[PDB]
Design an enzyme around this catalytic site. Sequence first.
Site, PDB file in Angstrom:
ATOM      1  N   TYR A  28     -67.709  63.804   9.646  1.00  0.00           N
ATOM      2  CA  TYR A  28     -66.267  63.893   9.237  1.00  0.00           C
ATOM      3  C   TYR A  28     -65.331  64.652  10.380  1.00  0.00           C
ATOM      4  O   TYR A  28     -64.027  64.255  10.492  1.00  0.00           O
ATOM      5  CB  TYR A  28     -65.765  64.574   7.964  1.00  0.00           C
ATOM      6  CG  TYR A  28     -66.040  63.225   6.952  1.00  0.00           C
ATOM      7  CD1 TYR A  28     -65.166  62.359   6.754  1.00  0.00           C
ATOM      8  CD2 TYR A  28     -67.162  62.955   6.361  1.00  0.00           C
ATOM      9  CE1 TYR A  28     -65.233  61.399   5.671  1.00  0.00           C
ATOM     10  CE2 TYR A  28     -67.460  61.855   5.361  1.00  0.00           C
ATOM     11  CZ  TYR A  28     -66.597  61.260   5.169  1.00  0.00           C
ATOM     12  OH  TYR A  28     -66.558  60.176   4.425  1.00  0.00           O
ATOM     13  N   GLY A  30     -63.948  64.727  13.429  1.00  0.00           N
ATOM     14  CA  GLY A  30     -63.491  63.816  14.653  1.00  0.00           C
ATOM     15  C   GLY A  30     -62.742  62.584  14.050  1.00  0.00           C
ATOM     16  O   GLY A  30     -62.386  62.624  12.698  1.00  0.00           O
ATOM     17  N   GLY A  32     -61.366  59.513  12.051  1.00  0.00           N
ATOM     18  CA  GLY A  32     -62.312  59.008  11.057  1.00  0.00           C
ATOM     19  C   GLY A  32     -63.272  59.822  10.404  1.00  0.00           C
ATOM     20  O   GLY A  32     -63.307  61.093  10.355  1.00  0.00           O
ATOM     21  N   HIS A  48     -60.167  68.115   4.953  1.00  0.00           N
ATOM     22  CA  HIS A  48     -59.048  68.144   5.725  1.00  0.00           C
ATOM     23  C   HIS A  48     -58.845  66.614   6.018  1.00  0.00           C
ATOM     24  O   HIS A  48     -57.764  65.995   5.756  1.00  0.00           O
ATOM     25  CB  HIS A  48     -59.560  68.568   7.292  1.00  0.00           C
ATOM     26  CG  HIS A  48     -58.539  68.517   8.127  1.00  0.00           C
ATOM     27  ND1 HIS A  48     -58.183  68.012   9.162  1.00  0.00           N
ATOM     28  CD2 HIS A  48     -57.251  69.639   8.215  1.00  0.00           C
ATOM     29  CE1 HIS A  48     -57.168  68.196   9.894  1.00  0.00           C
ATOM     30  NE2 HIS A  48     -56.495  69.018   9.217  1.00  0.00           N
ATOM     31  N   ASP A  49     -59.829  65.625   6.285  1.00  0.00           N
ATOM     32  CA  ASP A  49     -59.271  64.245   6.243  1.00  0.00           C
ATOM     33  C   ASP A  49     -58.852  63.803   4.948  1.00  0.00           C
ATOM     34  O   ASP A  49     -57.715  63.258   4.927  1.00  0.00           O
ATOM     35  CB  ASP A  49     -60.633  63.292   6.596  1.00  0.00           C
ATOM     36  CG  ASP A  49     -61.010  63.310   8.010  1.00  0.00           C
ATOM     37  OD1 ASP A  49     -62.094  62.506   8.370  1.00  0.00           O
ATOM     38  OD2 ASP A  49     -60.587  64.179   8.872  1.00  0.00           O
ATOM     39  N   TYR A  52     -55.190  64.827   4.523  1.00  0.00           N
ATOM     40  CA  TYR A  52     -54.456  63.940   5.417  1.00  0.00           C
ATOM     41  C   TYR A  52     -54.176  62.836   4.555  1.00  0.00           C
ATOM     42  O   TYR A  52     -53.079  61.987   5.041  1.00  0.00           O
ATOM     43  CB  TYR A  52     -55.029  63.912   6.750  1.00  0.00           C
ATOM     44  CG  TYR A  52     -54.539  64.819   7.910  1.00  0.00           C
ATOM     45  CD1 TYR A  52     -54.249  66.228   7.300  1.00  0.00           C
ATOM     46  CD2 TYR A  52     -54.257  64.549   9.091  1.00  0.00           C
ATOM     47  CE1 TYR A  52     -53.565  67.275   8.539  1.00  0.00           C
ATOM     48  CE2 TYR A  52     -53.760  65.297  10.154  1.00  0.00           C
ATOM     49  CZ  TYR A  52     -53.559  66.815   9.689  1.00  0.00           C
ATOM     50  OH  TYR A  52     -53.007  67.720  10.644  1.00  0.00           O
ATOM     51  N   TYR A  73     -45.039  71.278  12.894  1.00  0.00           N
ATOM     52  CA  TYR A  73     -44.592  72.235  11.965  1.00  0.00           C
ATOM     53  C   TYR A  73     -44.474  73.833  12.777  1.00  0.00           C
ATOM     54  O   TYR A  73     -44.705  73.736  13.909  1.00  0.00           O
ATOM     55  CB  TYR A  73     -45.551  72.343  11.010  1.00  0.00           C
ATOM     56  CG  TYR A  73     -46.970  72.562  11.451  1.00  0.00           C
ATOM     57  CD1 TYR A  73     -47.568  73.630  11.788  1.00  0.00           C
ATOM     58  CD2 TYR A  73     -47.870  71.439  11.126  1.00  0.00           C
ATOM     59  CE1 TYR A  73     -48.936  73.848  12.566  1.00  0.00           C
ATOM     60  CE2 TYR A  73     -49.176  71.390  11.678  1.00  0.00           C
ATOM     61  CZ  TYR A  73     -49.733  72.720  11.961  1.00  0.00           C
ATOM     62  OH  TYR A  73     -51.001  73.047  12.389  1.00  0.00           O
ATOM     63  N   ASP A  99     -53.958  72.040   7.575  1.00  0.00           N
ATOM     64  CA  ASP A  99     -54.446  72.566   8.790  1.00  0.00           C
ATOM     65  C   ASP A  99     -55.050  73.870   8.607  1.00  0.00           C
ATOM     66  O   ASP A  99     -56.123  74.493   9.076  1.00  0.00           O
ATOM     67  CB  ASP A  99     -53.554  72.622   9.662  1.00  0.00           C
ATOM     68  CG  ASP A  99     -53.321  71.198  10.510  1.00  0.00           C
ATOM     69  OD1 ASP A  99     -54.022  70.267   9.895  1.00  0.00           O
ATOM     70  OD2 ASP A  99     -52.538  71.027  11.402  1.00  0.00           O
TER      71      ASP A  99
HETATM   72  C1  LIG Z   1     -64.201  75.250  14.527  1.00  0.00           C
HETATM   73  C2  LIG Z   1     -65.446  74.139  14.887  1.00  0.00           C
HETATM   74  C3  LIG Z   1     -66.712  75.088  15.451  1.00  0.00           C
HETATM   75  C4  LIG Z   1     -66.691  75.212  17.448  1.00  0.00           C
HETATM   76  C5  LIG Z   1     -67.787  75.518  18.035  1.00  0.00           C
HETATM   77  O1  LIG Z   1     -68.293  76.924  17.631  1.00  0.00           O
HETATM   78  N1  LIG Z   1     -68.187  75.066  18.763  1.00  0.00           N
HETATM   79  C6  LIG Z   1     -69.461  75.555  19.605  1.00  0.00           C
HETATM   80  C7  LIG Z   1     -70.537  74.448  20.343  1.00  0.00           C
HETATM   81  S1  LIG Z   1     -71.453  74.983  21.085  1.00  0.00           S
HETATM   82  O2  LIG Z   1     -72.476  75.317  20.374  1.00  0.00           O
HETATM   83  O3  LIG Z   1     -71.347  75.986  21.901  1.00  0.00           O
HETATM   84  O4  LIG Z   1     -72.140  73.550  21.836  1.00  0.00           O
HETATM   85  C8  LIG Z   1     -65.362  72.497  15.305  1.00  0.00           C
HETATM   86  C9  LIG Z   1     -66.581  71.756  15.252  1.00  0.00           C
HETATM   87  C10 LIG Z   1     -66.109  70.289  15.477  1.00  0.00           C
HETATM   88  C11 LIG Z   1     -64.486  70.348  15.846  1.00  0.00           C
HETATM   89  C12 LIG Z   1     -63.421  69.234  15.339  1.00  0.00           C
HETATM   90  C13 LIG Z   1     -63.849  68.127  16.296  1.00  0.00           C
HETATM   91  O5  LIG Z   1     -63.990  68.415  17.830  1.00  0.00           O
HETATM   92  C14 LIG Z   1     -62.911  66.941  16.187  1.00  0.00           C
HETATM   93  C15 LIG Z   1     -61.457  67.143  16.273  1.00  0.00           C
HETATM   94  C16 LIG Z   1     -61.060  67.345  17.926  1.00  0.00           C
HETATM   95  C17 LIG Z   1     -59.322  67.911  17.907  1.00  0.00           C
HETATM   96  O6  LIG Z   1     -59.200  68.067  19.496  1.00  0.00           O
HETATM   97  C18 LIG Z   1     -58.906  68.892  17.287  1.00  0.00           C
HETATM   98  C19 LIG Z   1     -59.246  68.885  15.568  1.00  0.00           C
HETATM   99  C20 LIG Z   1     -60.943  68.428  15.205  1.00  0.00           C
HETATM  100  C21 LIG Z   1     -60.815  67.995  13.903  1.00  0.00           C
HETATM  101  C22 LIG Z   1     -61.909  69.673  15.669  1.00  0.00           C
HETATM  102  C23 LIG Z   1     -61.621  70.943  14.721  1.00  0.00           C
HETATM  103  C24 LIG Z   1     -62.562  72.133  15.397  1.00  0.00           C
HETATM  104  C25 LIG Z   1     -64.307  71.667  15.043  1.00  0.00           C
HETATM  105  C26 LIG Z   1     -64.144  71.570  13.308  1.00  0.00           C
HETATM  106 CA   LIG Z   2     -41.745  67.977  12.529  1.00  0.00          CA
HETATM  107 CA   LIG Z   3     -62.273  63.151  10.551  1.00  0.00          CA
HETATM  108 CL   LIG Z   4     -59.582  64.251  14.007  1.00  0.00          CL
HETATM  109 CL   LIG Z   5     -65.837  59.159  13.719  1.00  0.00          CL
END
Ligand SMILES: C[C@H](CCC(=O)NCCS(=O)(=O)O)[C@H]1CC[C@H]2[C@@H]3[C@H](O)C[C@@H]4C[C@H](O)CC[C@]4(C)[C@H]3CC[C@]12C
Ligand SMILES: [Ca+2]
Ligand SMILES: [Ca+2]
Ligand SMILES: [Cl-]
Ligand SMILES: [Cl-]
Length: 124
Positions: A28, A30, A32, A48-49, A52, A73, A99
Amino acid sequence: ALWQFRSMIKCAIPGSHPLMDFNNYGCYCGLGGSGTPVDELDRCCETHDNCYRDAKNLDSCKFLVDNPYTESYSYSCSNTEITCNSKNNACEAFICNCDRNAAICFSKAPYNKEHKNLDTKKYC
Ligand SMILES: C[C@H](CCC(=O)NCCS(=O)(=O)O)[C@H]1CC[C@H]2[C@@H]3[C@H](O)C[C@@H]4C[C@H](O)CC[C@]4(C)[C@H]3CC[C@]12C
Ligand SMILES: [Ca+2]
Ligand SMILES: [Ca+2]
Ligand SMILES: [Cl-]
Ligand SMILES: [Cl-]
Ligand SMILES: [Ca+2]
Ligand SMILES: [Cl-]
Ligand SMILES: [Cl-]
């Protein structure tokens, strides 16, 4: 809005990487989503999805190109504490809350590197 969500997240998670660029995660996190969340973090994204999804069903709210992510916001950040501005209109407040709940949820969930860029076509 999407760009604010990214900052809000870095607020709840001071981390050691600013614009580290987020990659897809699980089923989820990403654009969709499908099937069932694979773990804690993924559940945070599904919730979150769904939040929304609810937003899109608000009888009083209709967002640009029907995308809640376009709705900007106002919020503030302290010591990782997130506060949605009470002056946000109803539609903005609903989005800000979605959010905020997600940012907090993310900050409590483990990060399983085995779920980064998961093959959603087979495991989701
Ligand atoms: C806060 C979360 C952790 C980050 C992290 O520690 N990454 C480490 C990577 S690694 O181990 O160093 O490779 C990340 C995991 C996937 C991320 C999501 C995905 O990248 C999908 C979306 C991308 C959009 O730019 C922002 C919202 C969106 C919905 C992101 C929110 C932040 C998430 C939920
Ligand atoms: Ca607005
Ligand atoms: Ca999603
Ligand atoms: Cl997203
Ligand atoms: Cl996806
Ligand atoms: Ca509108
Ligand atoms: Cl609007
Ligand atoms: Cl409109």
